[model samples]
Target chain A: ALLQQMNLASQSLNYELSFISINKQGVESLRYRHARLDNRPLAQLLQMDGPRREVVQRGNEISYFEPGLEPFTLNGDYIVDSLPSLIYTDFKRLSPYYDFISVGRTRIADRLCEVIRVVARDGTRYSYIVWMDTESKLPMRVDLLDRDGETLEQFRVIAFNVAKFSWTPTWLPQGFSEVSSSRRPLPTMDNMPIESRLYSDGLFSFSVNVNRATPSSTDQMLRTGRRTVSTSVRDNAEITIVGELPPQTAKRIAENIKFG
Target chain B: ASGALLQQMNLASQSLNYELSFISINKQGVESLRYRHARLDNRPLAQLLQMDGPRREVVQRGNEISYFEPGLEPFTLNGDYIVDSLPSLIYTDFKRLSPYYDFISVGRTRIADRLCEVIRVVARDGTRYSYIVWMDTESKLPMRVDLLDRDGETLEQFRVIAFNVNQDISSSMQTLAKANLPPLKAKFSWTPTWLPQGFSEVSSSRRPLPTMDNMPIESRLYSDGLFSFSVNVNRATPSSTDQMLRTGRRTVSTSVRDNAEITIVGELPPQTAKRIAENIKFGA
Candidate 1:
C-alpha cells in the first residue's frame, strides 16, 4: 500500500500534460475531437496554454466555449484543464469510498511535488495517485490506477493556481457529488471531463458512462457484488446522455437517449 | 414510453447483427471503422476498417474472440467475446450497472425522424468511468450513446446509421481473411506485469521501439476491461529508471526492477505510474 501511496504521489501534482502526439515520424500530431466549438470542430491549437477552453455537451445539445465567452450561455462541468482531484482529500466531503494519507516527495511535471495517496480499504475500487504542489497543499495531478498499479485513466494540470475561478454548472443530477459541487470550467479537456467530488454515500452508487461508438457490439452492463452499471460507446462526438441511476433507472434512462 | 421501447429494440437486435461502425473526426480528419459479424453460429467474424486503413481486427467463435492488430499477430481468447466487447454488464440478467449509475427520466425529443425520450445517467463516484446512454422508444435500441467526461462533456459518441435488426452477413463479407499480412511473432517476454482488477492482457509483444533512436525495446500491453495501455522495458543510460515524465494526457513511469528497466505509459496520473513502478514484483 505504501508503494501505491508513493506512486500516487505524482497525482494532484497540478502539472500540465503537453504531448506532441506525432506518428512514427513525429510529424502531424492530431488534436481532433478535442476542444470542440459550438458543435463544430475548431482549428488545431498549437499552444494549449494560458486561458482555458470549455466544451459542454448535454445529451444531443453541445455548447463549446471558455470563461470569456460568457453571455452566449454555456453549461459545463469542468473547471480548469489538468485540474487535480482536490475533492478526494476531502474525506469529510467524499467519505463515500476510500481513505486518504500523506506520502513523501516526488518530482513531477518538471517540478518537485508532494504526494498524498488515497487508498481503498476494500476492493470497492482502485487506489489513487495524487500529487500536490510542494509549496502549497493544492493538488496538481490525479491518476486512477487499477490493482496492478497501472493507470486506467488520469488528468493533469498544465497550469493553475488555488485561487478560485468563477465556475458553476447549470444542472446536476441527484446523488452526484463534486469537488466544488458547483459546475465550473477548467483549462484542459474543456469544462467537462469537468470537476466533481463524487461517491456512493451509502450502498447506492452511480456511474455516468460516456463512450465512443462502434458497430457489431452490444452495450455492456455489469454487476459487482451488489453494484451494477451499463455503458455504450457511441460513434458520435455529441453528448447524448449522462448516467448515475439504479440499473433499472439507468436502463429506463438508456431507453430515452435521443436528440435536440 | 415510446423511447423506452426503442431502447429494448436496440438490445434484442444488438446481440445479433452484421455491420456495426463508428466514425471519429478531429482536426486530424476522420478515424472511422466498422464491425461486421458474418455468422450467427456463435462464431462471429468481425473487421475494423479504419478510414485511413486497418486499425483493428477481431473474430469471435462461441465465447472466444481473436483480436489482431498491425504490430502483432492474432490472439484468440478463451473467454466470452461479448462481455469483452460490450459494456461491463451486458451478459447478466440482473440490474447490472445500476449501483454505479443512477438513471433519471429527463424528457423526450426527436432523433433521425423517430420520437425519443431523454434521460440522464450520472456517475456516482469518480473511481470507475461513466457514460450517458440515449435509447430509442419504438425500436428499443440506442439511437445514440454519449460517454461523458468527468465534467459532463462527450468523451465518445455513436449515432446509428441503417441498423438492421437480426440481419446476418454472408460469406462475401468475411473475405478479409484471404488478405495477405505480415508474419508477426508477438508475445511478451516471460509474460508481463499483472494489472488491476477488471483488466486483462489485451496485447502482449516485443517490438522495435524508438527511445534509443537506434535500439529496439521490449513492449507489452494491458487493459482494465476499459482503458488500454502499453509497458515498455529498455536499457537506460546514465538516467535513473525511476524518473517520471508527462506528454499530454499520458504519464510515463520509468523504474528499475531487479536490474531491468521498465517504462510504463497510460492516460493516468503520475502517482499511478509510481504505484505501478513500486509494484513491479514477481508472483511469489
Candidate 2:
C-alpha cells in the first residue's frame, strides 16, 4: 500500500527536490522540479555544479540542454534519470519480482519517514532499503546493496517541496511533441542500436534500454546524473539500460538477460 | 613570520569584528553552524551556535571556552579554539602552524560573494592529512577549508555561506562578556619527550578519573595547527604490552611504563600516536 500511494503522489502531485549526491568522484548538487498539468507531465532537472546542465520533460518528450550538447529531444512517457525506480515504478508490476517488507521508521532531513526493505525474489539481483516521507509519501532515501551486503549506491532527499500550481514548459523546444520505437523488429545486430524504451505497468512506468549486439568497449561502467546510462552485457546481448532507475538497477536488469 | 597570509589571517581574526555563517558537510550529512566573533579594545568575545537538531551552544571570552549542550552538565574547556565537526581554519592562528604544515597561496576564486584567495596547507610528511583554505581577499579571514585524505580526496568541507563585517560587535558582545566563566586552571608541568613538528602544549590539567574513584589523572592536549592529540597519564600498575586500536578516523594508543598508564587519542595513524605516548617526560 505504501508503494501504491507513493506511485500516485509522485505522478499526481507537483513538487521540487534539491539534493546532493556523493560518491567516489566527489559531490554533486542538483534540483529536480516535477509538475503535472491537465494530466500531462512537465519536469526539469538543473545541475548546480560545473557548467550547469538542464534536462526538461514535456508530456511524452524529454530534452537535454548542457553547455556543449545540441539540445536534443527524445520520446518518453516521463522523466527517467533524475530519480530512483521507487519513485517511478508502479508497485503492482514490481511486486512479482521483488518482495517488500516494512523496516520500521526513522527521521531524515527533519522529516519522519517509513522504511521499507526491497529484496529480489532471487539472489541474482541487488536489494534496497527505501525511506519514504510519511506525510508526502515520496521516497526520501534509498540504499542499494549487493549480495555481500556492501552499499553500492545511495540516493537521499536533502530537501523536498510540493508545488502550489502546475508549471508551464516555456523552455522546451518549439513543437518537439509534434515529432516522434520497437521490439516488433528484432533489435539490430552489429551497431548496437541502443534500444531505449519505457516499460509501463498499470498506473506507472520506468525507462529501460538494451543493445543486443557486439560487446561495448567503453571503460566507464558507471555514470551519474538526471540522464545517465549504465551498461551491462551478457551472452549475445550487449545491453545498455538508460532510465530513471538507479544506476545499479539498470546494470542488474541488463545482466539478468537471456536470449530466446 | 614566514607565512605572510596566515600571519595576516591571525591578525584579522583578533582585530576585525565579523559574523560568519557556514555549513559543514561530511559523511553523516549537512549541518549549519554560525560564529559571532567580536573584539573591543582588550576584551574579546566569541559565540558558536548549532543551527539544526539538538540545541548546543559555545560561548568564549578571550580563550576561556564554555560549552552548553543538551542532556548534560554545562562545562568549560580551556583552549584558544572550539573543536566541533567544523574545521577550525577560521579561528586558529596559522603562524603557530608553520612548522607542521607548509602554507602556499595557490590562487583565487569567488566564494560567498567574496573574491577569496586559495591556500594549500600540506603536511611536511605523510604522518597527517593536508588542507586547502579559501581566505577572503579583503578581510584575510578564511572562508572555506577542505580536509583531504592521504590520497588528496576531500574527506570534509567547511564553507561559509554568509559573512557580515562591521565596525563593532553590537550591544551583544557587551552582554556576552558578562556570562559566568570558569576560572582558568593552573597549567600542568609535565611534557612529552617527542612531538611532531609545529605541535606545542595548549592546555593541561589534573582531574579524578570517574571510573577509577579518587585516582587523579594528568591530561595534556597538543595540536599541530589542524589536527590534535590528547595524552592522559595515570598512576597504575605497569603492563607488559603496548596497544593500538583504530575506529573510523580516530586512532587510540596505550602504553604502560614508569608505573604510569599513558593513553592517547587523536586523528592520527596508530604508530604516530603510540610513539608520542611512549615518549612522555617529566617537564617541557
The TM-score of predicted model 1 comes to 0.34
DockQ of each: 0.01, 0.01
Model 1 off-target regions past 4 Å?
A1-260, B1-14, B18-22, B50-111, B114-125, B137-143, B166-224, B228-237, B240-262, B267-284
lDDT of 1 by residue, B16-120 (tens): 555645453222234455545454544444454443454655555544545555643454444444322333222222233344445566677766566665656
CAPRI level of candidate 1: incorrect
lDDT of 1 by residue, A155-242 (tens): 4544433212122223332323432222222111111222222234321234333322322223555433223345443333112222
- lDDT, candidate 2, B164-242, per-residue tens: 8888676777778786665526444446888777776666667543220123567677777567767877653211235
Against the native chain B, each candidate's TM-score is 0.51, 0.73
Superposed Cα deviation of residue B44, candidate 1 (Å): 1.0
Per-candidate TM-score against the hidden true structure = 0.34, 0.43
* Candidate 2 collision pairs: A80-A244
